[PDB]
Amino acid sequence: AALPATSESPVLDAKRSFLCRESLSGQAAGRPLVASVGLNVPASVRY
Amino acid sequence: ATYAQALQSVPETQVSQLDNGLRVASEQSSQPTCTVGVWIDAGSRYENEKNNGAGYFVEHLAFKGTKNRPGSALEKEVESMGAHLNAYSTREHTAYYIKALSKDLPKAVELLADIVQNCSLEDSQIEKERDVILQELQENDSSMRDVVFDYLHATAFQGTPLAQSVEGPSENVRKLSRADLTEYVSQHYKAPRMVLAAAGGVEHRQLLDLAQKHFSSLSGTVPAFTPCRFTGSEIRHRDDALPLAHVAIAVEGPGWANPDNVPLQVANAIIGHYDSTYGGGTHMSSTLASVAATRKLCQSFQTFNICYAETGLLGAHFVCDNMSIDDMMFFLQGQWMRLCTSATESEVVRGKNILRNALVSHLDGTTPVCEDIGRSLLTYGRRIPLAEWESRIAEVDASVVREVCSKYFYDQCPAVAGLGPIEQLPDYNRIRSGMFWLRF
Amino acid sequence: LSRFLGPRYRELARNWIPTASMWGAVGAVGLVWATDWRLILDWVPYINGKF
Amino acid sequence: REFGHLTRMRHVITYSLSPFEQRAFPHYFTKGIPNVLRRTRACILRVAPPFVVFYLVYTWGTQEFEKSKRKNPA
Amino acid sequence: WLEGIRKWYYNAAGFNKLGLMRDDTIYEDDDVKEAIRRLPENLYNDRVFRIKRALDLTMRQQILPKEQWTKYEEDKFYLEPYLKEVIRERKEREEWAK
Amino acid sequence: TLTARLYSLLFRRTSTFALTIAVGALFFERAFDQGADAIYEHINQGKLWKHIKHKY
Amino acid sequence: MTNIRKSHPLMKIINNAFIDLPAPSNISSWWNFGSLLGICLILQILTGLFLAMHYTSDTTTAFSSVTHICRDVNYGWVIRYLHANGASMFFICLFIHVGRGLYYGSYMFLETWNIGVVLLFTVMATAFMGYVLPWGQMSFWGATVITNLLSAIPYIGTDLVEWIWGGFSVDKATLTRFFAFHFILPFIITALAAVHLLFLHETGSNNPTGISSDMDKIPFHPYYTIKDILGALFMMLILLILVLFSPDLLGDPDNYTPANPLNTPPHIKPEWYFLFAYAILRSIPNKLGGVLALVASILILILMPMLHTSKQRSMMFRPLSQCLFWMLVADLITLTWIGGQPVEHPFIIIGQLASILYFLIILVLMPITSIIENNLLKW
């Protein structure tokens, strides 16, 4: 609602560097992707 | 159910205090889950320039091992019971919350009693974590938002411990030695500056007994920060290879208690947040959002209210292309002065509803509720009930907002932090001149 | 037009009336000062010495 | 505003001929005179009446003035 | 009847001589500027060619032969719904502004 | 500090700034004209047609 | 590497303003007057400079200087009468330009319309001072009357009038300042005309039909440039006929008597191009009311974009409104004739009705009628 989610997403932009084994931890999806765009709330994913 | 009844029918955050000074608190409502955490009152704010980054290092080393739980055994306890251990350390706070099932709340408390009091700080582990700290800092270099916010903190609170980053300088990361970490854990993890907060189905008496049976042997019953200063300046990291240019503008905000927080949070709520992947676009009541969607001059912008104890940063951060920074600054400043001079009732009502929804929706789940408890017991000194929050929102009106924005925004030297193709960004003189309106 | 008046515009006016009215006061003082309107300066203490 | 950002148009075919093979005065009188007569017919009844009433007003004023300047029995 | 005077004014207006059906002679304000934009492709193309014909004729100071003068009873109002919708949206926007 | 109260009272809003400019100009004109006229009168004392007109 | 027409920074504006400017395809001759004004201004600049070549703006020698121009200087009479009749023709084209703007709905262009109103004001002031310069009987007496009209302003009336006069009456100072003002003002008109063109170019032009011609634009160079040249040739024809066959046709002979501030001429009629306001000035019995009506007669052009209500931009398709507009033109002609005539029984009442109806058409009749056809055309 008042909350802009958390990850404010820029297109034509790069990601965050992940050059750590710990950083990597978790990236590997365990559950299927689910897209969720919304009015007043930014679009994100969940895997 | 008339809303106000629901706020009145919220379980109270029961709080007690041990002899050592541990502030134990719980919000037992219904759930079979819980989040139990110990919110330290440490962070990069309480660190000298030699010790900068020690808090981050301690946070990393906390979960590795303890004397009672050597190394992976600690992890073996967290995963085998289904618990999720996590930590977070900002500039003025540090916490280690272990989300778990309400049935096994005892063990978790014992586990927490291990992590915060009896750490390991193994030297080989210290080097292994030093390398990880270095590579993770190189990672955070890519994070444009974090980098810009650290730039803002450096340029605003220059010459003060607030300027120090959480991770610390890369030189320190290599120069920290086990003696420094032991001193930090023996000087900033003292019992008085501790908040043991638990949410979910956690009976308060059981929590108190567990704390008295696990956290008793702690420090008995000075470094207490220095009032930092605001210095209107700017850091411009012109780098024309980044596709977008992140800019953050802020002014000295209120203190942690500083009831002026409630009106300002409404005022910022009027500005709102916009990005490219939103819905309505050219329909939002926020004039900045509507204009941005009408011209696509914004990629993603939001209003932040980072608020420390003695001071705080209140402003907006926007991400856009190279040829739209000036239009941004113009519209952002113009809306700020519009709220400053003529705020009117309708958008004030919209901001009141927006803030109500923010506070209400944030406080769901054991982790956010426990975080609220731990942070409130440290900053405000009490858990401000949602009923009190509603009462403090209710009397905010157009005149109150028009006066608080006048006292915080009008004719105030700002702090600017730009990164990327920020050449279009106006110099400090034009930005400062934006904060006064000759038409007023 | 009908686009004017209504709720929002009247408190907008109430907000901007002090500023606009005292800008008009600025204009009145500037006009009498620049044109040296003897009539008005007859009733100010210092500046009677001009005439 | 220059040529290119003006409009969107489709399926419109425009022919033309150079000024060097078409007579610059193609049946000038033969088609011009009916054209001018039609244009005059279209607008005379809506252009002339105010001018003729102006003419009447002007002439009337001229005599009325000079009669006022004439003598009078006494 | 009133339709008599309506038809008389339609014939006296003259835009029927050039082939224009009423809506082609609209003064393009902002609301109209949106109204053309919202039109479907076929109607928009027909309107633009029709206006091209009128501009050509006025440059030549000529009119269509009597046959291809758009009839009063055949003047289709292809823009009235879209323009009315734009006006209603503008009124709602102004009311919310109030 | 005096200047802080001065700024808060009459320098924040640009309307107050303009009003202060107007009234300050109005008073400063009298002050400067009197001062300069007195200075010129003093340095050329006994020479202009103001020390001598009463003598005729 | 690139066409100099669209490469040279100075050539950019000229090419985008006169060579490759997209203009409506169906532009009638009524738009040619836009050029006819500007070209005419240059003659007024060109001739007016040469009059300034041999001219002593002094009460005792101004008339002698003008006679020496028209009698002794080589072809000085040509320049003098070209200048005077060019000013009259300039006002002819100005009136036709305003009429075209009123008809084909060009006042929707706002900024150009207001700038044109300012142009009109400046041009009339310039012509007034110019007629003052020769220092004939009509020159001096008309100047006295028109500047005395400013006394109607409350409070500051007399001081303003004495300020404009430069003294106590129209004399040495008045003529001397009027000459310099007449020198400067046309350059202000030129800069303002450049601003006029700049504002116009952003909205293209209004074709006679009134519908947008964005999809039928044509290059400017091979087209109207030649048509504008033809219009300028016709304008030169009219001007040369006026100069060479009856120089003083549009001008009162009484001006040729040297200005004597002791004898009021039998008539104090101003130039032909001002009577339309002057008559209005005569109509209102109140002096201040007369001045306000006089200024409002010209100022009413500013209100025109506001008063328009017909959903059609142009007057091409509004018959009843066309009858109203031609009634307005007839009213303007009647006002000019009335201003020419003295203030007697038959003319006073005619002037009253002419002024009232001239205002009534613009304020009431035209918008009320514009409602009528909108209701008539099912919208």
Ligand code: HEM
């Ligand atoms: C805006 C264009 C101009 C107009 C409408 C205009 C109008 C007039 C008029 C009507 C006269 C009176 C002529 C007479 O009664 O014989 C005149 C005189 C004069 N004008 Fe202009 N003028 C213009 C431009 C200029 C310019 C630019 C100059 C100077 C370079 C100038 C210099 C003079 C001079 C010296 C006289 C006095 C000689 C004379 O009477 O002709 N004029 N002007």
Ligand code: HEM
């Ligand atoms: C100094 C005298 C003036 C000059 C040199 C001048 C110049 C021009 C020129 C060259 C054009 C383009 C040609 C045209 O459309 O006719 C034009 C258009 C226009 N002018 Fe003027 N003008 C003058 C006075 C005025 C006046 C008095 C007005 C009315 C207040 C005015 C309003 C307009 C308008 C509305 C247009 C747009 C006409 C259209 O494109 O449909 N101008 N002007």
